[PDB]
Scaffold this active site. Structure first.
Site, short mmCIF file in Angstrom:
data_model
loop_
_atom_site.label_atom_id
_atom_site.label_comp_id
_atom_site.label_asym_id
_atom_site.label_seq_id
_atom_site.Cartn_x
_atom_site.Cartn_y
_atom_site.Cartn_z
CB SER A 106 22.60 85.85 93.74
OG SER A 106 21.56 85.32 94.49
CG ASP A 188 15.46 83.39 90.53
OD1 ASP A 188 15.60 82.64 91.51
OD2 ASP A 188 16.34 84.19 90.17
CG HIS A 225 19.09 82.24 91.64
ND1 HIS A 225 18.56 83.47 91.59
CD2 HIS A 225 20.17 82.31 92.51
CE1 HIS A 225 19.27 84.29 92.39
NE2 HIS A 225 20.24 83.57 92.96
#
Lengths: 320, 319
Positions: A106, A188, A225
């Site tokens: 991330s 995502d 994610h």
């Protein structure tokens, strides 16, 4: 990248930055085959990686090291980057002046690329970058004004159109700086747009090995994610990237038979359960964390690359 | 010649099936002008239809009712069908033994046609079927079965080549059974093939009113899988199908003027925004949901129609 010359100064003392770095069963000053792990928004290093890349990288023969910039990566991404730059400096020296890989989730990928863009000294010290679900262009889903009209410093910075993502781009940071693999997913739920399998995607770097899961596993393959980091598919790509003589994952090293969206096979049952639940602590940390109504000011080294953007102190003007 | 005789036994008790059925401001046992809404893969009834056909059917004078088979339509499509068959039975009786329309999205259409094929009792209880982006042939975008990733029961079953899709076709189920309208799009990113405007298309039923959006609106007209359900064009065709005395949409009721790909005009700005984000919950349910390495076994009633296909227990025979 554009920046050259000396590294910008750190805002934090070296002791503070050192305190943010931990290696498994070793000191950063004396470590065999380190890998630096950079966590996601709303997490510490262990929270991002205990259930996944800490044990997985250990089994591949690395000593996992990680940073935990306080509070849970919610503060200014520019400060989070100081922890990473200091860590690379430390681990390069501590492994005998040997280049080391960096693996991220991330925001961690944004942090890595920010460091490589603005701190020239680490460009020769990072061997390769393996970034899972990075948000180099930020995300259109960040919603800093959604619900309560305040949001975390780093959430502002990760919003598409932010001064920070503007500065990264304009300094040359949307092109890979070291050999880089970016693994991401069209589905995502945190980072968008990711659907195009092209330079429109937030995880895309020019010249990088850009691996959209759906381009390999098919249009209907679903990983979120967190799964972008934890899945068996993600493990197979990461393993390829870490082993490759090109410093990037190789297409021949992974295929349709590797399209397992569940947590990596080699994880223990306890680790698999924790890996599936990765998002929960992050959401809790974001809820209870620092929040403001403006994007943090750019540090002087970055300001020339986002003139005209608005941060807390006002509109960014040209820098003498 | 379709399957006949008694309905197959339910694997689920009536109480469990009843618990999956909800009507808007009414009990299923006493409902005026019900319409049964059957959701897509990875969604509940409200997730599929809150932003669209729940309010839209209400404005048309119906009481919307829906089923929400657990978990989020990811379980065996044959069990999802039990929820629908039970609901039709309940709502037929609840509306005074009058036929009711069924309106579906995605897998919901497959469920409706499976029910009509294998449960003869509901043929007399379903007035008409209005199916948006139905995958009667499944989808080829999943790739071949022998290469499929670990996937939910219903995802296996919706893969082209599956024993379920084989059984539906071989039993006579790719020809309409009740008056049916199928609205679909050549640019569907979930269900393919849909490009031919012909029986090749996954959404096509023989004798059905088969409406490929691009055949009316041109090749530049773009609606995706969700847009097939939510668009203004979709609303006009749906309205036609629900009102028509033939039980199918009429070409006289829709045309080039109606070629608006955006969410239905009558929806509020917020409903329009929610309609555009229809797919997100489906991904989330898939991530958290059941996954397996084989297609679920066919129920005994369907086995004769897929002989030589492979499911979890082995090779299908008439048994």
């Amino acid at each position: 990248a554009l920046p050259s010359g000396s590294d910008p100064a750190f805002s934090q003392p070296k002791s503070v930055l050192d305190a943010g770095l931990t290696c498994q069963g070793a000191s950063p000053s004396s470590v065999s085959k380190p890998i630096l792990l950079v966590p996601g928004t709303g997490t510490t290093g262990p929270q991002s990686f205990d259930s996944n890349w800490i044990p997985l990288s250990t089994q591949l023969g690395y000593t996992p090291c990680w940073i935990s910039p306080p509070p849970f990566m919610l503060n200014d991404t520019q400060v989070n980057t100081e922890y990473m730059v200091n860590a690379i400096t430390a681990l390069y020296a501590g492994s005998g002046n040997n280049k080391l890989p960096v693996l991220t989730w991330s925001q961690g990928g944004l942090v890595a690329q920010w460091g490589l863009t603005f701190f020239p000294s680490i460009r020769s010290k990072v061997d390769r970058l393996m970034a899972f679900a990075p948000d180099y262009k930020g995300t259109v889903l960040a919603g800093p004004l959604d619900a309560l009209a305040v949001s975390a410093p780093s959430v502002w910075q990760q919003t598409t159109g932010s001064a920070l993502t503007t500065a990264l781009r304009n300094a040359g940071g949307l092109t890979q700086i070291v050999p880089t693999t970016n693994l991401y997913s069209a589905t995502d739920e945190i980072v968008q747009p990711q659907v195009s399998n092209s330079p429109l995607d937030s995880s895309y770097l020019f010249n990088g090995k850009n691996v959209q899961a759906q381009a390999v596993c098919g249009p209907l393959f679903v990983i979120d994610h967190a799964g972008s980091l934890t899945s068996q598919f993600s493990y197979v790509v990461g393993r390829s990237a870490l082993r490759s003589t090109t410093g990037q994952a190789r297409s021949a090293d992974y295929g349709i038979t590797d399209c397992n969206p569940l947590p990596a096979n080699d994880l223990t049952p306890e680790q698999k359960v924790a890996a599936a639940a990765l998002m929960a602590p992050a959401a809790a940390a974001i809820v209870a964390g620092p929040k403001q109504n403006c994007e943090p000011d750019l540090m002087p080294y970055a300001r020339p690359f986002a003139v005209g953007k608005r941060t807390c102190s006002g509109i960014v003007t040209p820098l003498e």
